[PDB]
Structure 1
């Protein structure tokens, strides 16, 4: 049977960097690393530079997801921002991928704005999730306010005046009451979150989805077993940092012994994030324009490009 994806291993993908030079120092790179997430200069050069290239070809060739329709009715004024999305399991390290992609796309061919918006800011406040009995489902599609997320991207893309975005706080495990921040129309918009690939055709009737505004979608992938230990390990680091803040919504986790923490982390993964993984995330994997698969060392050892 024919498959829609082209597969490359590290050497093959890396070989596609051609001559894009790199615009980042090791120091700058290290600052982009996420908790329990390693990012080397070789990872940037071998994985992200070839991606920068491709991504750049697509942008300069005004080949967007809404290009055909525009020409079919009316191309107007354009100047339309390029929209890239980044999806994948919690703890997969999609936040680091977004950060470096944004740094590179910012100075690669020429200076571009490049805004990085995270989808979590668009979650329904803990209050609402409470009223809908949805917070054993934080991160699930229904725990997000997408009428707003879609309205946001539409406004940004379409050049609407004063657009603002809600902001999420991991310290209080909820969106900041009056934290909305203005977002200036950028040249490129990177959208990172769990629900960025949702479509009315994985599950639903119509409704409209944020994925319908995306031009290129990246899915950061890793086997279930690796994601489990990554989640647990990352949890243990939170115990040493974020959780030590007395105002932390999970401050009590700072007090758990190391073995209780591991226990608590597993049930949190198994009973919530894993469900989300299997139910709403994995299914979207084969819909991405690009898939990056990481190994035990957090490095991408395989790339799949949808032809």
Structure 2
């Protein structure tokens, strides 16, 4: 047996017994390629599950508040891990939208770990410009302190912001979080001190996370999704010489595809095998994706 309850697509979709015109438009605005049937059969039930954990947490809090005689609101935190291009950003944003359906979750914030990467200046200095996503490219102590402060009750917490448009951290663009729920999305949210032997931390991100989800998918599908996303970014930079991807418009489509393929195999895939995939069993829930991003399996810790 394993520490996980398992559900194939049908079993998971069977969990349903809930979307409005505004809500359907918002989901399409999130990702035009997002299937409404996928949302209805997979993500709605997932948001319900999450709400049960959150509700349970809120009720516990009230019972303990009475017993302990205390006076403070602390954000419930959900992290989302997985390979680059597996769909963390889409999953996070979909969950942010759905969790907003409950009157209790008036404020659902979303922060990605991309922002906590060391700026390109610093990475170049360390010779890590070809290692974005790897442990050493992150200012981990800062990421840990971010969730630590939130879990300490600090009213306003600030997070750095990254721009895939300029391919670097935005100098003066730090975002200020003022939330009932915080969704932390990043390939490294399940990593820990062992992943940073060069600069170890002893309290991990997971130590300040209530529920963690690992989005999973085969290497062959991840490669395809990565490349197709790359191509979209390239196309979108054809008339924007200020865009980082405008550098790929000079290449023929064919050489651009090979370039993307090389970025995937030598950087992102290597990162997946050495640092990301090994953290999968630390997740509260594993979301296994299949062709066309269809979820085929859901595993939840017993």
More helix by share: 2
Q: TM-score, normalised by structure 1?
A: 0.88
Q: Secondary structure at the match of 1:161?
A: coil
The equivalent of 1:102 in structure 2 is: 96
Equivalent residues, number: 299
How far the C-alpha of 1:157 sits from its partner, in A, is 2.5
Gaps (5+ residues) in structure 2? none
**More divergent stretch after superposition (163-172 vs 270-279):** 163-172
Q: Flag the 1:4–1:26 CA change in 2: closer, same or farther, 3 A.
A: farther
Contact 2:141 2:201 in 1 (8 A): no
2-structure distance, mates of 1:51, 1:130: 41
1-structure distance, mates of 2:131, 2:60: 31
Contact 1:221 1:293 in 2 (8 A): yes
How far the C-alpha of 1:256 sits from its partner, in A, is 1.3
Q: Flag the 1:173–1:91 CA change in 2: closer, same or farther, 3 A.
A: same
Contact 1:146 1:209 in 2 (8 A): no
2-structure distance, mates of 1:234, 1:47: 23
Superposition RMSD in Å: 3.0
How far the C-alpha of 1:7 sits from its partner, in A, is 1.2
2-structure distance, mates of 1:232, 1:209: 32
How far the C-alpha of 1:63 sits from its partner, in A, is 7.8
* 1:224-262 deviation per Cα after TM superposition (whole angstroms, max 9, x unaligned): 111011111111111111464211123120121111011
Contact 1:34 1:93 in 2 (8 A): no
2-structure distance, mates of 1:273, 1:135: 13
Contact 1:122 1:144 in 2 (8 A): yes
Contact 2:192 2:201 in 1 (8 A): no
Q: Secondary structure at the match of 2:5?
A: strand
Q: Flag the 1:67–1:131 CA change in 2: closer, same or farther, 3 A.
A: farther
Contact 1:167 1:180 in 2 (8 A): yes
How far the C-alpha of 1:83 sits from its partner, in A, is 0.4
* 1:155-205 deviation per Cα after TM superposition (whole angstroms, max 9, x unaligned): 223222442111111111101111112110x00000001111112356786
Does 2:66 correspond to 1:67? Answer: no
Q: Flag the 1:162–1:216 CA change in 2: closer, same or farther, 3 A.
A: closer
Q: Flag the 1:181–1:63 CA change in 2: closer, same or farther, 3 A.
A: closer
Q: Secondary structure at the match of 1:31?
A: helix
* 1:258-300 deviation per Cα after TM superposition (whole angstroms, max 9, x unaligned): 1101110111001100111101111011111111111111111
Q: Flag the 1:278–1:26 CA change in 2: closer, same or farther, 3 A.
A: farther
* 1:16-57 deviation per Cα after TM superposition (whole angstroms, max 9, x unaligned): 133xxxxx4466446545998731221111111211121111
How far the C-alpha of 1:95 sits from its partner, in A, is 0.5
2-structure distance, mates of 1:193, 1:35: 18
2-structure distance, mates of 1:97, 1:51: 11
